Structures are given as C-alpha cells and as structure tokens.
Amino acid sequence: MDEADRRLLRRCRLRLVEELQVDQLWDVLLSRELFRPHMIEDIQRAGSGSRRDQARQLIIDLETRGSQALPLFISCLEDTGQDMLASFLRTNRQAA
Amino acid sequence: MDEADRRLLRRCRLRLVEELQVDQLWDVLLSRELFRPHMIEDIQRAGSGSRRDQARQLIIDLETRGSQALPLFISCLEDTGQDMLASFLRTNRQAA
Amino acid sequence: MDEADRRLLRRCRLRLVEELQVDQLWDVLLSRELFRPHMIEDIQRAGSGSRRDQARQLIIDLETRGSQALPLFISCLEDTGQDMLASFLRTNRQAA
Amino acid sequence: MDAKARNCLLQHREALEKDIKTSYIMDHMISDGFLTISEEEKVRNEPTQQQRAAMLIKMILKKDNDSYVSFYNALLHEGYKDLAALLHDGI
Amino acid sequence: MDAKARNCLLQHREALEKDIKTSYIMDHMISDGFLTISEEEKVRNEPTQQQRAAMLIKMILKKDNDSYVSFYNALLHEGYKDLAALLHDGI
Amino acid sequence: MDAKARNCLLQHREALEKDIKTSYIMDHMISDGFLTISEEEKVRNEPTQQQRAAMLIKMILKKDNDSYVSFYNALLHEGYKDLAALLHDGI
Amino acid sequence: MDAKARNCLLQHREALEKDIKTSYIMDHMISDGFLTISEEEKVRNEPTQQQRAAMLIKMILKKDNDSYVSFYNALLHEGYKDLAALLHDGI
Amino acid sequence: GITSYVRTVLCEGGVPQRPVVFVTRKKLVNAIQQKLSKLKGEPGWVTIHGMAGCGKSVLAAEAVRDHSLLEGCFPGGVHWVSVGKQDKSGLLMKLQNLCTRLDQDESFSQRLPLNIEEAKDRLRILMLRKHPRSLLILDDVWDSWVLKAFDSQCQILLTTRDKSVTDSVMGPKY
Amino acid sequence: LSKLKGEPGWVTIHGMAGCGKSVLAAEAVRDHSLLEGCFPGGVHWVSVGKQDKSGLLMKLQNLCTRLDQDESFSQRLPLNIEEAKDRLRILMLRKHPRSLLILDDVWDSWVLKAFDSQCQILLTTRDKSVTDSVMGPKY
Amino acid sequence: GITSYVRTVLCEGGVPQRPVVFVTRKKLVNAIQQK
Amino acid sequence: LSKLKGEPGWVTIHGMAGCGKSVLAAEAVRDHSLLEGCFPGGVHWVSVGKQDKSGLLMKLQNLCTRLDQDESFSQRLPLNIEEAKDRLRILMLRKHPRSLLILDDVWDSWVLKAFDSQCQILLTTRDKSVTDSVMGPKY
Amino acid sequence: VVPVESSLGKEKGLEILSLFVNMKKADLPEQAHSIIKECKGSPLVVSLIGALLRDFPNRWEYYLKQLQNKQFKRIRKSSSYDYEALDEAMSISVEMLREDIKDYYTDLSILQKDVKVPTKVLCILWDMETEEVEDILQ
C-alpha cells in the first residue's frame, strides 16, 4: 500500500472511526478477499468489540493489505451503502 | 526552531506535560506534517507509554521540527479543542 | 524440557494456538500443576487477552515447565476433550 | 540466505514494514520452526508495528533460504498478496 | 551555591537518590530555567533511577542558589515532603 | 555460598535462564531478605527474560547460602519443579 | 564528496546536530546502502543525540556525493524541511 | 556600500580594513574582480605586481571588499595570510598558524605537524572539506619554494613584487 | 567612546604623568548607560606596562586564559604572538561579540601591533605616538 | 571530458592537475589504462 | 591447599633442587574439584626468580598490568613498591575476590614482604626460611 | 611494465608549439619545423623551448641555431618540472651507478648517435669476457 493511501487513512482516522458501520461489512471484506477470515475475527474482537474499536482495528490492518487495499475497501463500503464515506475517500484519492 | 520557541517549550515543560491530551493529536500531527509517521510511533511508545511520557517525548521532539514547529503545534492543539493550552502558548509567543 | 519437545511445540505453533481452546483449560493446568496460579493469570492477560494471544503465551511458557511439560499439557488437552490436538501431539512425540 | 533472496527482502523491506502485521506471520514461522520464542518476544516488544516488522525482517535477513519461503508463504496465507508478489522474485 | 546549601544536599543526597523520580522534577526545573535539555537527557539516559537522581543532584550541586530552591519547590510540589523537609535547613 | 551450591547453580544456570520468569521469584526473594529493590530493578530492566534470569542468577551466585535456599524454594513454589530438582544437589 | 557539498555540511552541521534525530535517518541511509551497521552502532552508542548527529555528520563528511543526497532526502522525508533547505545549496 | 554581513565574513578572514584615507581605483578593482571571478571553480592562481608601493595590497583588500563578487561566487570564507620574507624555519611557523586558524573546531589533531608537507595536507584537506569554496590571499612572497608550500591545489592568489615567483606552480595563472 | 558603535576602532587618552588618565578610563566605563545599551560584550582590562618582547608574550597567553573561561579552546597555549592574536580575534569575534578592551600605559608600537585584533581596543597612555602603526579610525 | 566528480576524487587524492599546455597520448594512455 | 578456605594464608613447598617442586604446584591446581568449588577467583602465577631490588620492581608492575585487564585503574604505573602492593591488595580485594597467587622460587624475604598483600599467595621454593617475615597462618 | 620511449609526434609537437605560442598551426613560422627535429620528442625539450619562447617571440631563430649548437646549457626555464634544463635531468641519472660501473659508461660515450653496435666491439674496448659484458649493459 503506497504512502499516499497510508497517509490518507491516517489523516482521516477520526471521520472513519466515527462513521464506519462494520456489521454488514464482514461478508463483503471476505467476499472481496480484502482480509482473510482469521483477521476478520481479530478485527471483530478488537478491544471491547465496540463498533469503534472494530472500525479502528479494521482501518489499521488495512495498511497491510496491499496496493488495492483502499479501492477494494471503497468497493466494500459502497456495496454496504456507505456512500458518503466512500465518496469522501474517492474524492481524496482522485484528487491527483 | 529559534531559541525563543525552544526556551518557551522548556519553561512551559510542567504545564505541558500536565495538560497535553495526545490521543486525538496523532492524526493531526500527521495530517499537518508536524512529525513523520515513524516519529509519531516513537512518541506513542515513549517510556511506559503513559499520556505524560508520550506528552513529554512529543514536546522534546518538537524542538527538532523547524521554525514552524510551534505555530504548527498550536494549530494541532486547536483542532483538537485544547483551547486553553493553545491560548497560553499563543499569548506567550505573541508577547513580542 | 528437552529440545525435541521445544521444537515440536514450535513446528505445531499454528495448529496449536490456531486450534487451542483455553477457556476450560485454566483449571486443569492448575489442577495438574502444569503452571503456577500467577503464570496462569499472566497467560489469560496476554496481549489483547484474545483466545489466540492466550494460546500463544501458553505454549511459549510451556517450554519453561520441565521435562513433563508436554505430556502433562497433553493430559490437560485430553481432559478438556481436545482429542485431535492431543492426538496430533502424541503421534509426533511417539514417532520415536 | 541467497543473494537474490536477501536483496529482494532489502528491496521491499520498506513497503513490507509499512503494511504487515507481525503476530500472525510469527505464528506461522514459529510453527514452521524458522522463528524462536525469544526472537518472537524481541519483535513483539517493539513500540510500533513498523519496528516490529522491521525487527522481524532484520532477523529473517540473517536466516536461511527456508525462512525466506516461510515468510513468503505466511504473507500469502495472511492476505499480503501484493507484497508476496514483490518477493516472488527472490526465490 | 551557598556552603550550607551544597552541604545540605550532600548530607541528604543518598536518601534523595533512593526515593525521588527525576522526570517530574526536571519538568519543573526546566520550566524554572534551572536545567537544560542536554542536562536533562544525560540524567534521563542513566540506566537506573538512582543514577538519574544521582546525576541530577550531581548537576544541581554545581548550580546557583536559585537552583537549590527550584529543586526544593519541585520536591514539595511533587509530594516528596519529608525530603523537602530535610533540605529546609539548606536555604 | 558453598562450593557445591555455587557450582550447582553454574551447572544449571543455562537451563534455568531458558525457562524461569523472574518477577514471581523476586517477589519471594525480596521478602526473604536476599534481594534488594535496586537489585530487583537491575534484573527487571534487562531487555529479555533470559538476561533477567541471567542477571538474577549472576547476583545470587555472590550471595550467601540462605539465598540459594530462597531461590530453590521460590522455584518449587512457582512450579519450576524439574529445575528445583536439578538444584537439590547443591544444598 | 564535492567541495561545496562537504562545505555546505560544515556550514550547517551545528544547526543539524541541535535538531535532528539519527535513527530514522540511519534507517534511510542503511536502506540506500550509504551507511553500514557498524557505523550505525557507533552513532547510536553516543551518549546524547547531539553527539549521535555529530558522529553521523562526521561520517557522512568522508563519504561520496550520493551519501550527501541520501542524507538530504532522509531529512526531507523525515520532516526536517528547513535543514534540508539549508543543504539544498550543497548539491 | 559595504553590507554588514560582508564585514562579518571579512573579520573572520582577517584582512586588514582599508585605510581611512583611501581613494577607489574603480577600473583596477573591477578588473581584478572580474578576472578574479574567472576561476569559478577548480584550482587557480592570480598574481598582482608593481614597483614598491603601488597600492598592491590595498587593491587586494579592496577587491574582496565588495559583496557581489564575493557573496555569490565565494560560499567559502576568505583567508588572508601575511607571508613576508622567510627563511625555511620561519615559513614553517606560518603554516602551523594557518592550521590553527582554519581549524576553529579543533576536531583535527591538536598536535601540529613538524613537516611542511604534512601542513600542506592539513591545508588541502581543510580547504577541500572544511572550507573549499575558500579563497586564500597572500602578501608579498619572495621565493618560489614558498608557493611550493602553499600549492594546495586550491585557489590561492599571491600579491607581490616579483612576477617570477609563480613559475614553480601548476594550474591556470593570470 | 560611544562613537565607534560598531566596527573596529581605537581611542587614545594622554597626559603628563599622573593626570588621572587611568581613573578616567575606569570611571568612564563605571556608568551603566553607555556600557549597558552599547556594550553587550563584557569589558576586559589589560595592564600592559612596559615590556621586552618576551614579557609581552606572557600577557597575551594570560589574556587567552582569561577570555576562554569555558576552556573549549585548546588547553595548550601558543608559543607565537600571532597565534595569540588569532585566539584573541576569534574569541572577540565569536566568544565575546561586543567586547571592549582597555589598556594601561603602553610604551611602544609593536605592542599594539600585537593587540591589533581588528576589534575595538582603547589604549590609555603617555605617548600619543604609540597608536601610529595601527589601522582604523583613531580618536 | 572530465566529470565534476572525477575532479572531486582527484583533489582528495592529491595528484597534480595536468599542465595547461598538454597533448594527449591516446594510445599510450589507453594502454596503461587497459592494463 | 583447601584448608585456608578464607582469610589470608601462605603455603610453602620445598626440596633440594629438582624435586618436582613446580610441577606439583602446577599439577595441584590442574584439577577441577579443589579449584572450581573453592576458588571462584582465577589463579595467577608469578615467576619471581632471584632479584635485585630494581628487578623485583618490574615484576610488580607487570603483575599490575596483568591483573587489570580492564584498564579502569590508572594507566600510569607506580614507581614505588608499596604503591604496587596497594594496587595488588585492592585488585585482589575487589577485582578478583577469591584469587590464589602462586610463586616460583623466591630467594629472599623482602620479596615476600613486597607480595604480602594479606591475600593468599603460595610460594614454592628451596629455602624454607623465606616465609618468616610474613604474618598469618603458614603451612 | 609499460615502457615509454621518448619520441612524441611531429604532428603533436607542432600542436604543442602552437599552444605554447598561441597561433593557428600554419601561421607558425618556417623556423619552427626544424627545431622540433632537434627536440627528438623529449616533450621536456619542447615545453622547455616552448615556454622559453613565451617571453621572447622575436628571438625565434636563435634557439634554432642554439640546438644546432648541441649545447643545452643555453635553454633554461623554471617549470612545474623539477629541473632547470634537460642537461639537468641526465646528470641526476648518471650519479647512482656503483663506482665500478660508473667509469664504464664514459667509454660508452664514444659510440655514434645512431649506430647499433654488435656487442663484441664493446667486449674489445672493455677487454672483458662476453658473458660478463652483456650483463652490465643489461
């Protein structure tokens, strides 16, 4: 995963951990092979297992998923209906 | 970073290490490029990793970030909502 | 604990921590005196306290519990009903 | 390890450190018998994951060829496809 | 510093080293302007807190009277009441 | 300490370092009077448990006979049965 | 290295030593292949960061032109913008 | 119009300040300076000469007195050495003294060379790394071995009475 | 004395013997206003007296030791007058940027030749011929 | 065509710079260099 | 040799010339059991020979250099025998707590007077008169 | 070992002479061609003549006849090179030879500028046996 995407996930930390809805993402992250089944459970069990803790662990692990981690993540957001979040991320990566 | 700002960070050591809230600063320090991702991790892992130890390492490393280190630091404090701390620092640098 | 057992537990690390069920082991590790009450709590508090982290710390500490650490560990696995895991370990040590 | 192996690691050790999570990878390497418990704790003890990755890689560099393949298989098995791809060159 | 000051320090430097934690005290002395960043790192770099305390005290001994009062105020402000009491004699 | 004691330690100090965890053992000792808080921090400050064990053992070797028994009782009390067994020879 | 390069370093080596943190910079230079592990430990072994910086700079001064650019890129990449600016003159 | 900064560099260099009662020689100063500009890089020697008391030193001091040629051209500071006339022993001391002057940091060995060549090494190395963009000016000079000694491969300009003096030396001469 | 606000400069004060020449020098600097605003550098006084070449040499080393309180500069002392001149100039230039040096007596020119650091030094004396070797504004 | 860098290494080495009035001996230089 | 488990002590071994006197000394310590349990300190051997006062002095400095491998102690060497005695005693006391020193020959008392560090030293020889100046248990 | 014969090239020396006096090669005077023949490619002689000419462009023939004279005491220049003149260099070489050898060289003096003499005649003058005579020459 390049520095631009890693920095983007860092700068956007708050917006992300405040807005991410993970309940319906699990299957899409698996279905698109963004994360492996073992990591998915690690994320769901992160911290207190609260939506925020899960969301935070998800975006941190994202840095380790390769060059297509972000656009793949964006695709999962969209098929989950999280359009504003997907939009914000897209506009940022596309601002190049 | 000039001597006035270095001296200011020294004289204000206590107030700073007693008041600094770092949890929500990380992303702003990164987003404003005050510190580099590697240093940010070094700060978070400083000492026992306690809020104070992190806060102390942050303000020490600040001396090495150039002439805009302080006003940039002040901007991160403000976008974190640490208004009294930002105010105190501003009044001091502006007292010239 | 001899080198053969120190290597067997390592080569099977995954199959172990990636299979180990610790919830019902605690009392058996204590009841058989495989570990001391304070180490048991250290293991349960390992990392995020996740089953995996606990399982990983358990098998690492096992190296320090003497020559009967493995066969004693195997006995705890069996009285916990973890037959496949106990079987795999037995077949390996018995392959001599 | 091989020259091309050691060099492939060095050539991509930065991209690796910036992404990979050491715990799962060390579980594999421990199981494979290419990483020790002590080595594992030195890596885990690092303050940030970038340093843990850095320490792991630092260690693997002084290891045999089989450890290069163990690390490569672990990356694949753990979802680090693109990074495993970059290392395919090395052996 | 004064004779009585320097001597009061020496008379109790052992009890001090065996109890005081330097970081908080150095925050105060840095703010007061009686300790430098370099001096602070030399103290912090010491392997054990007894040596850090020992280094701090070693430094303060060659300092002016105001540093003796800065160290004394810091001790009080930091909860080392009994040790500040012992130093009350010195100035 | 006794020749056989000091030697028994040396004869098994490697197996010990490779397995024992110092904190619990130091809790016992620190209570027996054979270990000092400072000694305890020097051991705790070591980067790896093998070095902590190594430091503890390094210290115990220069100690009296009672410390050999304190360390032996601690090992037993803490579950290091086999290692306590190996030291039974020493006193 | 070049006269202007070496001189640019000397002209600003003091401002550099008073601000830069060597570890991150050495990670870059090691990766670039312009710093060795031994050299890295000599620098790291220094008691204070000013001496570490001083040692690094002392070493770079006897290096080739590419090392001057490696150090310059590292500074930029690490946030030492103003100091990299001052060295822009050198090559 | 002297810049404040120019004086600061010049003070470090040690060139004498121009006599209070002086009168510019614009054409001459301009010529030396433009020529002096010429060896933009790479070694090089400049000789200036006249019958005794022709304004030879003052021009040298005056030429460098200006900001434009010096500042853009010469990132290295200017060092002035007063060579005079010397027996072999006397010459030796000047070298050590230039050694002490140039190495303000003292990082280099406190011990001083007992051999001329070793001093030549300390000069060349110091000019090369410590201050290469540096220009060295000499005063008088009456025999060749002297410039042989200073022949550091780094620009040095000698101002004098004999023009024969810079014949031993190698590199472009004007 | 205020006049040479910056840049080198020498001041000579003279009278027939016992005219209050030193006391005035001490007295002039005795005041806060001229000294404090004007002279961020400290004031250093040297008692030159009358000297053979060897005697003069020692005073220089002694001024060297006096000025370099830190000792950062080489503990070794110059055996050559000029080298001492370098240590003075450099020390005046960096270590004590705004410093004023006062001299007492002085009976021959080479002496001021020695002290001719390009940094303000004021000599107080009996002969007014003495400061003729020197260069820079003289009052 | 001297590289700027070549001169920088050469200066450190201390070899004299070639006399301004010189004339290459290509064959000879080539032979020594190849050898 | 085991007998002086602690606290100073000297052992003398003697015979008419060529009785196996040294080899036994070398041989006795050659074994693990007595040495290892008993002697946490290393063993140091010194070949004293026969010496004029000046000659003796050097051996002491050489033992000084040998014992202080770290070099933490002053690089400068004592010019006085007693000072060397201090360096030995102190070094034996702290640097090598359980050490045993063996000597070869020895022909006059002042010599052992010199080595009389209060730390066990065993001298092997021809005269048995030699260890009469010394104090502490002798066997 | 790479062995440098002292020769140079007539084309090259003209190249060198031009640089010494700064003129298009053709613009060079008729005198110039002949002096180079004397030079025999010892670039030291060419630089030595060349610099010598920098001072006195008018006295061009003079040195021509001077080298026609065959004495090198006339030609001198201070130079980067470590000797006043070409005669100066040879003297330095002669001294080293061990005294027994040294006398022999002088006998060697008689031999023509351009004769490859068969070893024997050297044997005859020396009166010393052939296996020996070759080695000193070696």
Ligand SMILES: Nc1ncnc2c1ncn2[C@H]1C[C@H](O)[C@@H](COP(=O)(O)OP(=O)(O)OP(=O)(O)O)O1
């Ligand atoms: N504007 C001026 N330019 C040149 N000379 C001046 C000027 N004003 C006054 N002078 C006089 C005073 C000085 O004594 C003298 C300058 O000395 P200078 O030209 O350096 O002689 P010099 O150093 O060449 O002599 P020497 O050959 O003996 O070294 O000319």
Ligand SMILES: Nc1ncnc2c1ncn2[C@H]1C[C@H](O)[C@@H](COP(=O)(O)OP(=O)(O)OP(=O)(O)O)O1
């Ligand atoms: N207010 C005053 N001003 C000047 N001189 C005073 C005053 N009060 C007393 N004196 C006397 C006492 C001193 O001996 C003397 C002052 O010495 P001073 O004027 O420095 O002589 P001097 O140093 O010029 O002599 P020399 O030329 O021998 O150095 O005048």
Ligand SMILES: Nc1ncnc2c1ncn2[C@H]1C[C@H](O)[C@@H](COP(=O)(O)OP(=O)(O)OP(=O)(O)O)O1
């Ligand atoms: N097993 C043995 N034990 C003793 N001596 C042996 C043995 N084997 C051979 N030897 C011979 C060889 C040696 O030269 C000699 C041993 O020397 P040693 O007994 O140390 O004499 P010494 O050192 O007492 O003589 P001196 O009184 O002159 O010092 O005996």
Ligand SMILES: [Mg+2]
């Ligand atoms: Mg002159």
Ligand SMILES: [Mg+2]
């Ligand atoms: Mg007076």
Ligand SMILES: [Mg+2]
């Ligand atoms: Mg013997």
